């Protein structure tokens, strides 16, 4: 018997656990799954469960009549917390015959379970009630005759409260007459009380389901509100794709897409001018809107907008949405994104790397290059690690680069922005893979790790005397192409070291300012001493650190690329010039000390 009691108890626990861990569902669904799955191990002729309404507070418009005295104050049953006894749902499981199950939303007081006050009293006090010969007791006035058209009559009642962890009562599980003629004994009291305690702890899973659905809704609302704030408004698009002012067309775009191509190809700067093909490109004389026009031109220039028939308005909206996705931080703003994208275009076209990659690969590279630091907060991964920002809890390593990838893929996920809408699936996977590779390759630790592999590739490729063999050798293996991809992304992100001295001095000042604001924050809000690179007090030490930054990082990349392609030979040459300039600033400081 006692073994059978514990086998029932343990089976009840295990199958209720199985059905709460099958799927995170609501209280009604979880108790339906548990009770109906444990239907055999209850061993009752019938039982029902009624859940109480959880509204602890009334809305103010429902409390006004009470304070005004228009409606007399509610007197009578009240839960121990003070909620009204209002069963909002009953689920009746009829196990005596036909195995019927019914759900009664908002049961009336006429409902046979609520006809007797015993669930109401259990909600009033939270006592466990064992009631022998229920129609013979005068207090709760149970049904003396048949309850319903079937010849079923109440003989015992075992009513228990489900308790939330705040000691609020959540429902009343009314287990009616036992299958045997015996009353409910303390062994069945123990079994049912164990069941009700497990159900009251599975209320955690129900509360977590409800919290998680609210979190998911709040997240999707916040993302959609962000999407509206970020997406280019129609006037922002029309500021570039001037179809209205030239095609004489209303707000609805019914124009031919070829005519939109024709009208845009006249509105984009000429790529031979403004040095869009040159390493010496400087974005300082261009406004961000001119950089958007340039970036659309650069997408045209790889000859991909027409070859894959991607729409022009989608491309323009995508570019402007990328511009708006960059913050106004001192250096990692949209200017850095466009300088990286322009450097990518120049590496493809002038660097002659395009011979290693398809049309689609080049298109993926340029789109990934534009978005590589989208929504940068101005602080390196170190600050995210130290301040424990939500980014650092979300993305473990390469925190910002994973954020920039995730946000640019979210931008591509909207169909009004998706330049890859008109391409087949396997091509979508290819472009997404190249997007991920290119964006994640902008973490400098990854570059530092893979320097050796890239150098081994370049050393192997220098041994062949003819270009056709080199292209066959590289293009056969995907991985070698991915290493060239990663080192191209790193060589573009650091491209400012290669820019002429006039550009380099101002960009190095901007980087130093962003690092000083980083150090200010770590000192003010974290009580840590900044690193001298991030210490504003060592402003005068800035040129020497730049020499080390040239001597340690970039020189390897541009040596390997100048070996690998003679066309990238000028880029390293500019780096060398900039080092000499920083040397003229470092040793003067040793003359000032």
């Amino acid at each position: 018997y006692m073994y059978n009691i514990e086998s029932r108890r343990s089976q009840i626990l295990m199958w209720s656990a199985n059905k709460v861990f099958e799927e995170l569902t609501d209280v009604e669904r979880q108790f339906h799954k548990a009770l109906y799955t444990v239907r055999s191990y209850l061993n009752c002729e019938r039982y029902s469960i009624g859940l109480l309404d959880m509204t602890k507070e009334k809305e103010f418009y429902d409390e006004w009549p009470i304070k005004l005295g228009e409606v007399e104050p509610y007197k009578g049953p009240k839960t121990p917390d003070g909620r009204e006894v209002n069963f909002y749902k009953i689920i009746d499981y009829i196990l005596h015959g036909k195995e019927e199950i019914k759900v009664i939303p908002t049961p009336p007081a006429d409902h046979w379970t609520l006809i007797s006050g015993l669930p109401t009293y259990v909600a009033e006090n939270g006592f466990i009630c064992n009631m022998m010969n229920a129609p013979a007791d005068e207090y709760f006035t149970f049904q003396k005759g048949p309850v319903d058209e079937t010849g079923w009559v109440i003989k015992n009642v075992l009513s228990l409260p489900i308790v939330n962890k705040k000691e609020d009562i959540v429902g009343v599980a009314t287990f009616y007459n036992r299958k045997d003629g015996k009353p409910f004994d303390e062994h069945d009291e123990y079994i049912t009380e164990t069941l009700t305690q497990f159900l009251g702890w599975s209320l955690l899973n129900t509360d977590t389901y409800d919290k998680m659905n609210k979190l998911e809704n709040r997240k999707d609302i916040a993302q959609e509100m962000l999407m509206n704030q970020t997406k280019a408004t129609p006037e922002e698009i029309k500021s570039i794709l001037k179809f209205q002012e030239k095609l004489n067309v209303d707000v609805i775009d019914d124009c031919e897409e070829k005519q939109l191509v024709a009208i845009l190809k006249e509105d984009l700067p000429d790529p031979r001018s403004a040095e869009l093909y040159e390493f010496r490109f400087s974005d300082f004389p261009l406004t961000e809107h001119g950089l958007i026009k340039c970036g659309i031109r650069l997408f045209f220039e790889i000859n991909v907008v027409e070859k894959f028939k991607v729409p022009v308005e989608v491309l323009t909206r995508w570019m402007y949405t990328v511009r708006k996705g960059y913050r106004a931080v001192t250096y990692h703003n949209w200017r850095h994104g466009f300088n990286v994208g322009q450097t990518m275009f120049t590496l493809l076209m002038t660097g002659r790397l395009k011979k290693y990659y398809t049309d689609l690969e080049a298109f993926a590279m340029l789109a990934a290059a534009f978005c590589h630091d989208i929504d940068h907060r101005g602080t390196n991964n170190l600050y995210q690690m130290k301040s424990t920002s939500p980014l650092a809890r979300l993305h473990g390593s390469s925190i910002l680069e994973r954020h920039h990838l995730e946000y640019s893929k979210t931008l591509l996920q909207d169909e009004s922005l998706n330049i890859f809408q008109n391409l087949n699936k396997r091509q979508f996977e290819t472009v997404i893979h190249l997007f991920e590779v290119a964006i994640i390759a902008t973490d400098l630790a990854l570059y530092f790790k893979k320097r050796t592999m890239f150098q081994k590739i370049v050393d192997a490729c220098e041994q062949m005397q003819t270009e056709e063999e080199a292209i066959k050798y590289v293009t056969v293996d995907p991985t070698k192409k991915e290493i060239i991809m990663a080192m191209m992304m790193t060589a573009c992100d650091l491209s400012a070291i290669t820019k002429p001295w006039e550009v380099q001095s101002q960009v190095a000042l901007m980087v130093a300012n962003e690092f000083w604001e980083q150090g200010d924050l770590e000192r003010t809000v974290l009580q840590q001493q900044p690193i001298p690179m991030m210490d504003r007090n060592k402003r005068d030490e800035l040129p020497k650190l730049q020499v080390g930054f040239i001597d340690f990082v970039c020189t390897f990349v541009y040596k390997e690329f100048s070996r690998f392609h003679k066309e990238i030979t000028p880029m390293l040459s500019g780096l060398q010039n900039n080092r000499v300039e920083w040397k003229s600033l470092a040793d003067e400081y040793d003359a000032k000390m």
Partner: peptide, 24 residues
Amino acid sequence: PKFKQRQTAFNHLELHELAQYGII
């Protein structure tokens, strides 16, 4: 009729230099 209360990697040179530039 009974009522009860409810029961309740990098090289060593990289490992040194990357700290100064905040690359770690």
